[PDB]
Amino acid sequence: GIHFGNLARVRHIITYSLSPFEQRAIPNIFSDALPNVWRRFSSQVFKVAPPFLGAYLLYSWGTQEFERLKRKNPADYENDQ
Amino acid sequence: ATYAQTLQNIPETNVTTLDNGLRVASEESSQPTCTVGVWIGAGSRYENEKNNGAGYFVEHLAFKGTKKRPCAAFEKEVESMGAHFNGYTSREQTAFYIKALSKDMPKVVELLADVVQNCALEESQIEKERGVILQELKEMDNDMTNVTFDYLHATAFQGTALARTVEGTTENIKHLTRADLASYIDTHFKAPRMVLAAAGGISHKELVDAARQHFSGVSFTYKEDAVPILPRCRFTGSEIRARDDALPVAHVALAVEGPGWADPDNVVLHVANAIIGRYDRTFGGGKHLSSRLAALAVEHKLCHSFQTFNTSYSDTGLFGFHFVADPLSIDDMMFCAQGEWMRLCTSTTESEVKRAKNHLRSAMVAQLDGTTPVCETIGSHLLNYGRRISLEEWDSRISAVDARMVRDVCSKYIYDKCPALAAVGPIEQLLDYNRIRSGMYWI
């Protein structure tokens, strides 16, 4: 339950922070934010997208194939009389 | 002989100004001994990125001899007359003063003037002190309290001049030139920006005379007799955290921007700080101390010590507190501390201020306990208020303070403000800025 104070042994690290009221909440949207969203997107698209593309194809096929097998095969009545 | 009467019967402080712009002030008593010195309105705040720590470097040579008399000579002469030579340099103020027999007030004045005007700046002595100053920076680096206050200024006034330390940077100390120090002295140690103050058994007219004789070198242009107003230093709510769990105890300092010398509210802030007080593990009073925070500290063993402060400056200042505690009691201490600050703005009592006012009176009276401290008051007062302020005036002001006034002033400077935080040592238990910021309202 109580942990702050006995977590880790740290030495020689200085940190600097500003009050929330002295800064912008959502700063550098175009110079930083978006450029990074692109970076992130880019670096994961070929890891993620591929398998989903594969599933999408299999879906398409199997769906079409299913409907195709519902159609009539003209070659079943060529010599019917 | 009542308190009131004793206050009115205190000899007045005499001030006169020379044509060069220098001011000479002094309070006369019947003491065979006296203190006289020159308080200069100079310091690190007046320096910049390239000459930071010059004023300090100078403070090191201001006693190693002048042109009229080299080191040994200067020293022997001062020593052989039983006089004490001390001085100091801060962010906005510097001072060189001497303690001696009133019988020498005049020879001393000549000595002072020689120090502030003809420092030898011995090229060889400079390289010798360069190494000394470097040793003091390593000594002072182990003074957590002072490391902590430096950091407090570093962040509270980040980006500005008050952010720099008085001693200066390592790079600067390693590269300051004989020319830079020279330049420093010339640019800052100037008559209109100085004050010749003395206290003890001395003739104001005899003082002012020796003053006319040695403090001369008048100015021709207008740029030489104008006291330059410094550019404002922006206060910033923020924190700097230097963590080292290898240190035995942690130091913490929290503060909000203060008004600045000239503001009357300072009388109230000092009464306020008097209510919270201060404490340290050797106060016999123990669990019975009037200061609530102090009492809690004792009961719950919240810290080794804590102190309040109202550090003034020309246009700004730092009002806050500082405590030393074990890594595991930082959170509770900070809690109780911020708690007391809320109580101030919200529920101060008449009884509380009554006590704090008394405590404050005997505090001001105690700062005039000797020639040096009184001389220090004069130098500072003329330099900050441009006039001496009698104990009777202070007392007049202190007496007007009441609970309501305390709440209003404190609410003004404390309530819901973004503070400046500096923490050093084993500070893992100190909660984040946001949590601390929330301790700034309601309680």
For B26, the enclosing helix (H) or strand (E) is: strand B23-28
Q: Which residues of B touch A5 (CB under 8 A)?
A: 327-328, 330-331, 428-429
* Residue of B167, B168, B176, B203 whose CA lies nearest to B121: B176
Residue carrying the six token digits 């970076």: A39
Q: For residue B293, what are the contacts with CB-CB under 8 A and spacing of at least 6? A: B276, B277, B279, B306, B336, B337, B340
Distance of alpha carbon B227 from alpha carbon B207, whole angstroms:
24
DSSP letter, residue B121: -
- Same domain as B212, residue B75: yes
Point out the residue among B236, B245, B433 whose CB comes nearest to the CB of A10. Answer: B245
Helices and strands counted in chain A (H then E): 1, 1
Residue B154, in any domain of the structure: yes
> How many CB atoms are closer than 10 A to CB A45?
10
Distance of alpha carbon B312 from alpha carbon B259, whole angstroms:
7
On whether any CB of chain A is under 8 Å from the CB of B428, the answer is yes
Residue carrying the six token digits 């819901």: B416
Residue carrying the six token digits 């330099």: B383
Residue of A nearest to B422 (CA): A16
**Are B238 and A10 a contacting pair at CB < 8 A?**
no
- Same domain as B297, residue B153: no
Helix B265-276, helix B391-400: angle, nearest 10: 70
On whether any CB of chain A is under 8 Å from the CB of B434, the answer is yes
For B320, the enclosing helix (H) or strand (E) is: strand B317-325
Strand order in the sheet with B305-312: A11-18, B238-244, B420-425, B250-257, B317-325, B305-312, B278-280
Point out the residue among A11, A16, A21 whose CB comes nearest to the CB of B246. Answer: A11
Which SS3 state, helix, strand or coil, does residue B421 take?
strand
Residue carrying the six token digits 């708690």: B339
- Same domain as B207, residue B111: yes
Q: Is the dihedral of CA B75, B81, B83, B89 positive or negative?
A: negative
**Are B237 and A19 a contacting pair at CB < 8 A?**
yes
Distance of alpha carbon B300 from alpha carbon B96, whole angstroms:
45
Q: For residue B351, what are the contacts with CB-CB under 8 A and spacing of at least 6? A: none
* Residue of B266, B251, B279 whose CA lies nearest to B430: B251
Q: What are phi and psi of B114, to 5 degrees?
A: -70, -35
Q: What are phi and psi of B129, to 5 degrees?
A: -75, -25
**Are A16 and B239 a contacting pair at CB < 8 A?**
yes
CA distances from B175 to A57, B126, B127, B135 (A): 72, 11, 10, 16
What technique determined this structure?
Answer: X-ray
Residue-wise DSSP of A24-55: -SS--IIIIIHHHHHHHHHHHHHHHHHHHHHH
> How many CB atoms are closer than 10 A to CB B271?
26
- Put simply, the chain A residues between 3 and 32 with a CB less than 8 A from any chain B CB are 4-22
B392 annotated active-site: no
- Same domain as B88, residue B197: yes
Which long-range contacts does B388-394 make (Cβ < 8 Å, 24+ apart)? Answer: B388/B13, B388/B15, B388/B25, B388/B27, B390/B7, B390/B10, B390/B12, B390/B13, B391/B7, B391/B10, B391/B364, B391/B365, B392/B7, B392/B8, B392/B10, B394/B267, B394/B361, B394/B364
Which SS3 state, helix, strand or coil, does residue B79 take?
helix
| Domain of residue B361, CATH code | 3.30.830.10
| Tokens encoding B217 | 């070198």
For B252, the enclosing helix (H) or strand (E) is: strand B250-257
Q: Where in chain A are the domains?
A: 1-81
Q: Is the dihedral of CA B58, B62, B65, B69 positive or negative?
A: positive
| Tokens encoding B55 | 């004023």
CA distances from B114 to A46, B68, B118, B213 (A): 79, 8, 5, 12
Residue carrying the six token digits 């044509």: B19
Q: How far is CA B406 from the centre of its chain?
A: 24
Residue carrying the six token digits 């946001």: B434
* Residue of B244, B246, B87 whose CA lies nearest to B166: B87
Which phi-psi region, left, alpha or beta, contains residue B403 (left: φ > 0; alpha: ψ -120 to 50)? alpha
| Tokens encoding B76 | 């022997």
End of a domain among B174, B195, B226?
A: B226
Residue B318, in any domain of the structure: yes
Distance of alpha carbon B372 from alpha carbon B388, whole angstroms:
15
Distance of alpha carbon B121 from alpha carbon B115, whole angstroms:
11
- Same domain as B207, residue B75: yes
* Residue of B219, B228, B194, B193 whose CA lies nearest to B19: B219
Pairing of strands B33-40, B194-200: antiparallel
On whether any CB of chain A is under 8 Å from the CB of B141, the answer is no
Contact B384, B314 (CB under 8 A): yes
Nearest CA distance, B232 vs chain A (angstrom): 18
**Are A10 and B418 a contacting pair at CB < 8 A?**
no
Residue to mutate among B148, B151, B152, B245, with most A CBs inside 10 A, is B245
Distance of alpha carbon B126 from alpha carbon B120, whole angstroms:
10
**Are B240 and A15 a contacting pair at CB < 8 A?**
yes
| Tokens encoding B253 | 């300092």
Contact B424, B141 (CB under 8 A): no
What is the span of the domain harbouring residue B273?
238-441
End of a domain among B226, B257, B279?
A: B226
Distance of alpha carbon B186 from alpha carbon B37, whole angstroms:
19
Alpha-carbon torsion angle B418, B158, A11, A3, nearest 10: 10
Distance of alpha carbon B405 from alpha carbon B407, whole angstroms:
5
CA distances from B202 to B26, B118, B199, B209, B242 (A): 8, 26, 7, 12, 50
**Are A4 and B243 a contacting pair at CB < 8 A?**
no
Distance of alpha carbon B169 from alpha carbon B50, whole angstroms:
10
Q: What are phi and psi of A14, to 5 degrees?
A: -110, 140
Residue B121, in any domain of the structure: yes
Distance of alpha carbon B197 from alpha carbon B26, whole angstroms:
5
- Same domain as B292, residue B390: yes
End of a domain among B195, B226, B257?
A: B226
Contact B211, B40 (CB under 8 A): no
The total domain count for chain B is 2
Instruction: Indicate the class that CATH gives domain A1-81.
Output: mainly alpha
Residue B4, in any domain of the structure: no
| Tokens encoding A69 | 């097998």
Pairing of strands B194-200, B23-28: parallel
| Tokens encoding B31 | 């003491």
For B305, the enclosing helix (H) or strand (E) is: strand B305-312
Pairing of strands B420-425, B238-244: parallel
* Residue of B242, B224, B180 whose CA lies nearest to B49: B180
CA distances from A14 to B130, B244, B338, B425, B427 (A): 28, 9, 24, 11, 11
- Same domain as B287, residue B309: yes
For B253, the enclosing helix (H) or strand (E) is: strand B250-257
